[PDB]
Amino acid sequence: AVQARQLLSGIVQQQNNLLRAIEAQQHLLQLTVWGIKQLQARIRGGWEEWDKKIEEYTKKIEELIKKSQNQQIDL
Amino acid sequence: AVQARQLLSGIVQQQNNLLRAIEAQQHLLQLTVWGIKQLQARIGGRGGWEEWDKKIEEYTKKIEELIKKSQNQQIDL
Amino acid sequence: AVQARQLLSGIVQQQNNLLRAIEAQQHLLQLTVWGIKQLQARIGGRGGWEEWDKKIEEYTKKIEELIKKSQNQQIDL
Numbered sequence: 433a434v435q436a437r438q439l440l441s442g443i444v445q446q447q448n449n450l451l452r453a454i455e456a457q458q459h460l461l462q463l464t465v466w467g468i469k470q471l472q473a474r475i476r477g478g479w480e481e482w483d484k485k486i487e488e489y490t491k492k493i494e495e496l497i498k499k500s501q502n503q504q505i506d507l
Numbered sequence: 508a509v510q511a512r513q514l515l516s517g518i519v520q521q522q523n524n525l526l527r528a529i530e531a532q533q534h535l536l537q538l539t540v541w542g543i544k545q546l547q548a549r550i551g552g553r554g555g556w557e558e559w560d561k562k563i564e565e566y567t568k569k570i571e572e573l574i575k576k577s578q579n580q581q582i583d584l
Numbered sequence: 585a586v587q588a589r590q591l592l593s594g595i596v597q598q599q600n601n602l603l604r605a606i607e608a609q610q611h612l613l614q615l616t617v618w619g620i621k622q623l624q625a626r627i628g629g630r631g632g633w634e635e636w637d638k639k640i641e642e643y644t645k646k647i648e649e650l651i652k653k654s655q656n657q658q659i660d661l
Contacts, residue, residue, distance in 0.1 A: 439592060440514060446599055446657045447521050453606050453650040454528050460613055460643045461535055463636065467620040468542040474627060475549060482538060489535040496528040503521045515591060522598050529605050536612055543619040550626060559615060566612040573605040580598050 441507045451500050458493055465490075516584045526577050533570055540567075593661045603654050610647055617644075 465486060472479060540563060547553050553560075617640060624630050630637075 436511075436588070436592075440518070442657060442659070443518060443592070443595060443599065446603075446654055447518065447525070449650055449654040449657060450525055450599065450602055450606065451521075453647055453654065454525065454532070456643045456647045456650065457532060457606070457609060457613060460617075460640065460647065461532060461539070463640055463643075464539050464613070464616050464620060465535075467624070467633075467636070468539060468546070471546050471620070471623055471627065472542070475546070482542065486535065486538055489531045489538075493528055493531045493535065496524050496531065500521060500524045500528065503517065503524060505517070511588070515595075518595060522595065522602065525602055526598075529602065529609070532609060536609060536616070539616050540612075543616060543623070546623050547619070550623065556619075559619065563612065563615055566608050566615070570605055570608045570612065573601055573608065577598060577601045577605070580594065580601065582594070 444505055444507050448504060448506065451497075451504060454500075455497055458497065462490070519582060519584050523581055523583070526574075526581060529577075530574055533574065537567070596659060596661050600658060600660065603651075603658060606654075607651055610651065614644070 469476065476483075544553070547556060621630070624633060
């Protein structure tokens with residue numbers, strides 16, 4: 433009882449740590465994407481599909497993140 | 508009992524969402540790697556980046572291993 | 585009882601896998617940051633990317649803090 437409570441709370445707490453890390457990593461990722469796009473632009477045709485997949489994965493990540501924020505509990 | 512199941516399942520669901528996000532972030536990261544690599548090629552060659560290339564291969568392999576590892580461990584309650 | 589332990593241990597092992605993947609992705613991410621910065625420096629100066637650099641740093645430190653914070657909370661059953 434006291435055991436299981438401390439265990440599950442600890443588990444729940446680290447889930448919030450992992451999620452917060454994932455969100456920060458995503459913010460970092462979007463910054464790198466911008467940097468690349470700006471470099472391709474200083475030297476963007478032929479990168480249409482590349483742009484599309486990025487948008488695809490980015491949308492999915494943002495969806496999953498939002499879906500995780502609501503699933504999240506702070507015990 | 509009812510409390511335990513709901514709390515546990517909720518935790519299991521949360522983990523599957525975190526994993527899915529990690530996978531999509533990995534797919535996203537590999538796209539940026541290529542993007543950089545193609546820029547480096549467009550500007551002596553890609554010489555001097557052999558070690559850089561190495562660590563990427565190292566971490567990429569490790570991530571993919573850990574992901575597959577997490578897929579086989581993951582449960583869909 | 586036997587059910588709960590096996591289920592809770594499985595969950596904890598999964599968290600360990602997810603965390604390790606996040607650390608490896610972070611290593612990979614920092615490699616991409618370097619690659620970009622070196623291309624920016626090889627093509628006026630890196631002026632105008634001050635704010636960009638600052639946010640990279642901001643999120644990077646936050647990630648590393650969150651990672652270390654998760655390594656402590658981490659248990660191996």
